[PDB]
Every structure is written in C-alpha cells, then in structure tokens.
Symmetry: C6
Subunit: 205 residues, 6 copies
C-alpha cells in the first residue's frame, strides 16, 4: 500500500503477512457472504493495483467467481478507455489506460507515481471500485434464497426470523409482516402503520 510515514510523506510499503493471511482466511471461512466485501475494502486500505491483484490472486478456491470478476474488471476497464483515451515525453508520467488501473500493464513504480502525484491519480481507489462492483455481483449470484421464501416458522422466535430476513435481503441487495407466522402477524397488524423494527420486535418478543 501507499501510507504516510512518521515524517508525513506518502511512501510505498510492502503488503503485510497479517493482511495477506486475513484476506485468505476470511474468503476460506465466509466465501461470498455480503460482509466479506467491507472486510476486503478495509484490508485493502491504501492498496496499489498490484496489492489488489495480490489479494485476489492469493485466493485458491472460487475460480468461477474470480473469472466472473475479471469479466467485470474488463468491462470497467473498457468503459474507462472509452471516456479516457490516451495519446512518452522523456522522464514524464504517462496517462493510465484501463489495464494500467487494473495493474496488468503498469509497473509498481508507475502505480506509485500516479497515486502520489499532486493531485493524485488514484488508480488504487479506481480499481478497488471496479473490484467491489464485481464482488457485489458475485454476492448476489451466490445468494441462495429469495426473500419471498424467508417465512417465520410456527415455533421460531421472531428475532431469529428477522435475522434470517435481513440476512437474505442484504445478500439479495410489509413483507416482514406478511411472512411472519399467524400469531405474530396478528400482533403486528394491530400495531398499525409506522411501527419501528424495535417496536415490532418488542411486540412479538
């Protein structure tokens, strides 16, 4: 990543073994559950494109997902090149193409040059956005259940049902009441409109 040193200059630092292991382990344990995306984003804080490829490339499983991700990245790269055509002046900085942002045709030094320029050409942040776009599609693809099929069991605590409901809604990216069981549905219908989730949860507790 690029970080501020103690003196206050923006310097490149090696990606840490702790960061590398954290990402690999979270993918092993959580696959593409929605909460993996904000973990990815936080673990890649200050990442160069090189770092971002490192993180993606260190994943051993899920190669169907990783191939879908490349497709998304290539679509975003092509759209970048459409909006940002490029024409080298000796010792000067060239303008990044899509594949330079994605780290496949740019060097680490070029990446550092862009990201620490004044003003910065934030190739790490641009690439991270494309990756997250791609990961969101994967999360939704691998979401196993429609919210229409999240219905409260006859003996299921309301809390547990609501957990399943909003878990599913998050992965999928009135119905809460309609899908409740008969006893809690009746209680919730008599709360009237504009009840908060807290009030519903209290009511069916």
């Amino acid at each position: 990543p690029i970080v501020q040193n103690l003196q206050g200059q923006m310097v490149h630092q090696c990606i840490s073994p702790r960061t590398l292991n954290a990402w690999v382990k979270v993918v092993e344990e959580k696959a593409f559950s929605p909460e993996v995306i904000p973990m990815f984003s936080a673990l890649s804080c200050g990442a160069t494109p090189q770092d971002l490829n490192t993180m993606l490339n260190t994943v051993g499983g899920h190669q169907a997902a990783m191939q879908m991700l490349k497709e998304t990245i290539n679509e975003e790269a092509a759209e970048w090149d459409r909006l940002h055509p490029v024409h080298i002046a000796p010792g000067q900085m060239r303008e990044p193409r899509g594949s330079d942002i994605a780290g496949t045709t740019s060097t680490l030094q070029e990446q550092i040059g862009w990201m620490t320029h004044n003003p910065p050409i934030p190739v790490g942040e641009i690439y991270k956005r494309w990756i997250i776009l791609g990961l969101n599609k994967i999360v939704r693809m691998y979401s196993p259940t429609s919210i229409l099929d999240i219905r409260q069991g006859p003996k299921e605590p309301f809390r547990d049902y609501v957990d399943r409901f909003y878990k599913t809604l998050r992965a999928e990216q009135t119905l809460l009441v309609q899908n409740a069981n008969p006893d809690c549905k009746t209680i919730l219908k008599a709360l009237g409109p504009g009840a908060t989730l807290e009030e519903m949860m209290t009511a069916c507790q």
Copy 2:
C-alpha cells in the same frame, strides 16, 4: 483512525487487521452481552465514521440488530439536522449534515478535514455516541431475563447468585435480599440497614 504520529501531527492511519478481527470475533463470541459495548468503544478509539461503518458492516450475523441500529442512527442524524441546518466556497470546508457524520454522504477526506480542523469537528466521536446509543437499546432488547426472576437457588452459593443478579441488572440497564434463599435472607435481615455488598457476601459465605 486518526492518530498522532511520532512527530506529533494528527494523521489518518488504516484500520488494522488486528482491530478488524478483534471486533468480528467479540461479536461472534459475545453477541450483545453488555461488555461488548465498552470493547466496541475501545476498539474504535480515534475512528473516522468510515472506520465505524467498517466495523459495523463486517458483522455477518445479527442483521435484525444491525437494522435496528440504522434506525437509531437515522433518528440521531435527523435530530442533528434539526439543531444544525446547513446553507460551497472554493477550497473551503462544508458543514456536516447527519448523514455526513454517519459516513454515508461524506468522503474519507471530508471526515479527516473535520476531525483534524482547529478546533476539531469531532464527527467520529459524534457518530460513535449515536452508535453506542443504538447498541445499548439492542443490549436491553436481547437481555433475556427480568431481575424479578433472578432468585437464589436452595443450594446456590450466594456469590453465584449475586453474579447472576448484577449480570442481569447490567443487561437490563433490597431486591438482592428479597430474592435470596430463606437461609441467607435471614442472615442478611439481621445485618441491618447500610450493609455493604462485601459484608453481605461475607455474611452468606
């Protein structure tokens, strides 16, 4: 978070893999037991709003709770906007709205600008207060037992009973004596008024 470097300037630092993992693990292991709140507060020391959302968003379970939390945050944000209406001067700092404090409509750079201003506009601390307000409501909601139902068993050591009593009181946010078993109740009644907890515990040991 925003931290003091070695030289003494307030700089942004990436949230650490250790911090991220600690929060996720404490929620996995403790759910919304009351002691999770001071852990949250300590793990988010110096946090930007971005960091605070990261921590909340990396939680995979408990989505009923996370949705209740958003409701609380939105109520606190709306009350902020009521008390702090906002009117951009080129190169100048805009005033934060509720949704800027909550990190949903403000950039990391804006957040850093506010938090390191002289005097600081402490958007991380303001947001953390709203979050803790929300978490406290959740702790109380998920508190399983009334203090009225914490009663000492016939063979239950007084210490163990008092542990359950104050554990419950903490989650719920004279009765100690009334809920004691017959033998310890008699001992405690004869200590008279103004006995300390230490003296009660000694007496029934």
Copy 3:
C-alpha cells in the same frame, strides 16, 4: 495510555487490541487468583482513568466482584474529596475530584491534561491504586481455604504441600512444620530453629 513517543514527548495512544484481549483472557482463565493483580498492573502501564474503566468494563463475568470494586472506588473517591476540596478560569485546568480520578465525570482531554501537566497530576496512577485496593479485597474474599486447613497428605510430596501452603497464604494475604505429615514433621523438628525453606525442602525431599 500516555506514552513517550520517539521524539520524547508524552502523548496519548489508543489502548491496543492485544492489551484488551490479554486482560479479558486472564480474567476468563484465572478469575481472582492473586497473580491476576500484578498482570492487571502491568497491562495498565501508563493507563488513563478512561483506559482503566475500559479494562474493568470489558469483563463480562464476575459482576458481584465488579460491584464490590465500585464500592471500594467510591470509598476511596470520597476520602480523596475529604482531603482535596475543590472551589473555571478560562482556558485553565480545573482540580480533579474523586469521580474525575475514577474517570466518571472527567473527559479524556482533562485526564491527559492532568497526567501530562508539569508536574503531572497522576490521575491514572491514583485511580490504579484504588482499583488494586479493591481487587486485593476480592482476591481475599474469593480465597477458598484457610491456611489452617492446608495440611500435608500422608503420601504427598513435601514440595507439593509447600506449593499449596504458600499459594493459600498468598490468596489469604512454624505452621509449615505443624501442618506437615508425621514423617516430615519429625525430620523438620530435628533441623532446629532458623532452617531456611531450601533446607526444609532438601530435608524432606
């Protein structure tokens, strides 16, 4: 905590995830065995009152103990206010009350101001003393056995007996010989007065 930076100024630093976890784990594993107190003291090196409350508040169990601790803290705070009555001059430092030392009515900034003043008003150290006073009372309360009941078994190695003896004495805060078994008692009686523990242990080995 407040620490010396690399340059040599006294700066506030966030309490680390490692420190937080170490304290929580030691309480989980050891409860109020006497050795927990020096661990507490070492883990809270340079602690502000805020840090000290964090450590105490992150403990999930033992709420009978934590309530006894508050009582001790309140007694020490009241005695502080008796010896140190307080009368704000714009931009000047106010004098700390007991509840300010205990971190319940003082801000982090006030705490830093006191602890880094020249000379320092060491509110973290003062509060830590009160807490340790309280923890010592708890260790003694939870000490399960009188030293009078630590007696050497007929087949019990002398070393193991002495371990139990001094373990108990430490928790409780001639008898070694009297409580020894008949065979070792006879050996120890013939060593005469002024035998070291080493010599006794050698003698009964």
Copy 4:
C-alpha cells in the same frame, strides 16, 4: 529485505519471523497449488537474493521441486551471463554475474550495494523473476488433471463444475459448454454465442 525507513532512505531490514513462518506454512498447507506463487511474490516484497534463498531453503519437503527449481535458476543464470559478460577497481562496485544474482557467489553487502545503487541494479527483482519462472513450471508439472477430464457430474451444481474447470485451467496454465452435463449443455446451447460466464452461470443455476 530493503525497505524505506521513516526518514526515507533505502535500508536493509532482517526478514521477519512472521514472514518466514507464513511462507513455510503456506507451502506446508498448499504445496504447489497455483495461488502459492502470488503469495510467494508478496511475501518476498523487497527481498534481497539472500532473503529469497532463505525462503526457498527453509522449505523442508518437496525436494524434487526444489532441485527442479535450481535447474531453472541455473539456466536463467547462464542466459544472464551470455547477455552480460563481466571483466576490481578499489572501493568500486563489481558487475553481477548470474550466480551473484542468485545469491550463491555474492555477499549481503554486495546485494545491498546493487539494489540501493542509483540507478538500482535490481538483483532481488531479477532473481525473483527466475524463481517464479521455476515455480510456474512446478505448478504445471504437479497439476494433476487435464482440462479435458473436467466434466460436470449429472447431479453436480454448475457453479461447482465451473470452479473445478477454472481451478484446473489455472494449474494447467466452448469447452466449458462441451464438458457440461446434458441438461445444462442444452440450456447453454440456446443462450447463443457471446454469453458471459455470469449469464451461463445464471442460466444453469
């Protein structure tokens, strides 16, 4: 490795116990699965040739692989010497031979001298390229299955089949449709040409 200090000079640092352990553990757990190579590359960020040999030499198993790697390294070293023949001026820097790049005939001090020269003679990066060339050959050798033999089972979810397919293709370094089972093959044939992987995966979900 060679790193930037806080002041901004390029200094040698000892390889960390964390880095050493991470590499050894990844080889123990993953052997020569393709994802081990980007992990190697990231763990050896800023590595001297000495560091690179350390990492390779700390591997206890897989000595057939490590011997094949030496062969590749020696071929790359010989090709370096063919393109870069060398002729010592007192106190001056000598030009590196292949075996100097590979760290077998150069000292740590010579390596640091080359890597921190202006412009740098990047012996660590040159050697890392040769090593990765060698590791790629090993990954391919140890790839157990031809892509021709990755065929979807009659009850096998399409996702799981695609995972196996691209996993195999990666190790090996239209067919997706041809190797699908009859039911999904029919669905995929009716999508027509130019279907994305996402669309295929959606179609057979």
Copy 5:
C-alpha cells in the same frame, strides 16, 4: 524496560503483553527445567526491577519456589548493604539499598534515574543476577535424578541415552562410558582416550 528510542535516548517503555504472556506460558509449560533460565534472561532484556518483579509476580503456581527465590534475593540484598552502606540533597539522586535494587522500596522513577545515570547504576542488571542465582538453586532442587542413575537401556539407542545424560547433568549443574550398556561400553573402551562425543556417538550409532 529501558530501551533506546529511534533518536537514540534511553527511555522507559511499558513491558509488552507479548513479553508478559511468553514468561507466564514458559513457566506453565516447562516449570524449572534448566532452559527456562536463559528464556527468563532474554525476556527481561532491559528490565527495570519493577519489570522483574512483574514477571516473577505474574507466576501463579510454584509458590514454594517463589518463596525460596525471595530468600535468595534477601540474602543477596543483605550482602549488598554490607558492601554498600548509605548515609537527601534536594533534587539529587539517593544511593540504592538492597531492597531498592529488588524494587520493593524504590519507585519506578528512582529506578529509571539510576539505570539512565551517566555512568548507569545498573539496578535492573544487578537484581537480575540475584534472581538468576535464585532460579539456578531452584532448577537444581527440582532436578529429579542423579547422573549416577542415568544408565543406557539394553535396547536404548546411544543418542537417546546421551540426551538423557546431558539433560540430567545440565539440571544437576568416563561416567558416560561407565553408564553405557555392555555392547556400546565395549565399543567405547576400544576407541581409546581422547575420543570426542561425535566419535563416541558415531561408534555406537
């Protein structure tokens, strides 16, 4: 401990949670096996007397040993006071007594003052020597077996026997041949005088 900062001044640093845990764990796992002493010495590098007491006091078991250690420390302290009698000049440094070196009657500030004086009065190193003296006595006391009773079994590999022999000798603080089994004894007798351990081990392999 007292350490050199980045600038090069001798500063106090808090004892780390990692150091504290390492010591406690090594005592839990190894008790007073001889190798615990060099681990102690290395873990207490730069330690103040306060740090040294912390390490000793965090040990929960082995209180017979810890009491023997105090006896040794008190003997060394008394001998210090015999050789170094002491007579306070306002703002000046007082001379340390034995109990000041042992950290029982000196403050952390006094300890830092002595250890960072020019020339240093190395109270941490002096105390560490007394502690190690004490620990050595304990290692020897808890050594379970005489070297006279380490004899090679009829089927026991010579290597394993030599391991037991020198393990015992280390704890206890020609015979190798005499205690060997008949077959290896005969081989070793025919090597003649001045055989190295390597040659003996080769001979009986």
Copy 6:
C-alpha cells in the same frame, strides 16, 4: 541483535519474544532436519554472540547435540586463537579471543563495541559461522538413511521417490536412475544422457 534505527545508526535491540519462540518451536517440531539451519541463520539476523547463546541455550532437548556443538565451537575458537594472538589501553577496545567471539568471556558492551566499530569486527557473524559448522555436523549425524537405501517402491509414484531421494541427499550433505523401479528405470534409460530432472519426472509421470 544490532539493527539500523529509523535515523540510520547501528543500535542494539533486545531479542524479540517472537524470535525466541520461533526458534524454540522450530527445534521442537523439526529437530535437526536440514531446513532448520537456514531458519536458524535467518532468525539470528544481526545477532550478537549473546543472542546466539540465548537461542542455543533456550533449547530444552537434544543435549547430546548441544554438547557436540560446544565441542565444534571450542575447536573453532582454538583455531581462531592460533591465527589471532592477543597482547588494556584505558578507554580502548581490546582484541577478541575465541571465547570472546563465542560470548563466554566478553560482555554485551564489548560485543556491541566490536560489531559497531568502523570497520566492524563482526563477532556475531564469525560466531554464527562456527555454530552453523557445528549444526551441519549434527544434521549429518542425525541423517537416518544412506542414499544407497533410497529405492523406488513398485507402486511408488516417481515424484514421491525423487522427494525421498533429494531429501536424503540434503541430510547426508545416475544413482537416481539405478535406484528407480524396473518400469521407470527402462523409461529413464531410453531418454539418453543429459536429461533434466524435469524431463525424467515428466517421463515417469
């Protein structure tokens, strides 16, 4: 060890708990498998003689090996004294004897003085060489099998056989073909001379 600080001076640093634990654990898990030596060398990067003794002395088992190591060290020390006889000028640096290099008769301060002199008298590196010489002898002694006895089983994959072969050769410090099983021997004989290991392994795959 001696390290470069952030400013760029060569300073002494305490050996870290992580380093100490890594060495102890690698010896526990791997004993004197050949790969332990490069791990030792990397873990003792920048080590003083004091640090090197610490690492060796913290090993609890393998005392036959540790005694053989001392013998090797004493032979290397005696040869040092033969080549480097020594004659103290007030405030000046004395010349190191063999036992000073081995850290048994020199102080930490003397060691630092030699290692940071201009030019450095690299006593840590000199001692490390002697230790590694000694460790190599031990690796070879504890090598359990002659390369003559590594022969491919009738059903043994060629890869697994080659792994055992080069593993053994490494510990021991044409035959590959001769020791292959009949079927692979025939294949390898028909490749002709100058086949690479890769080509042999491909051929028998």
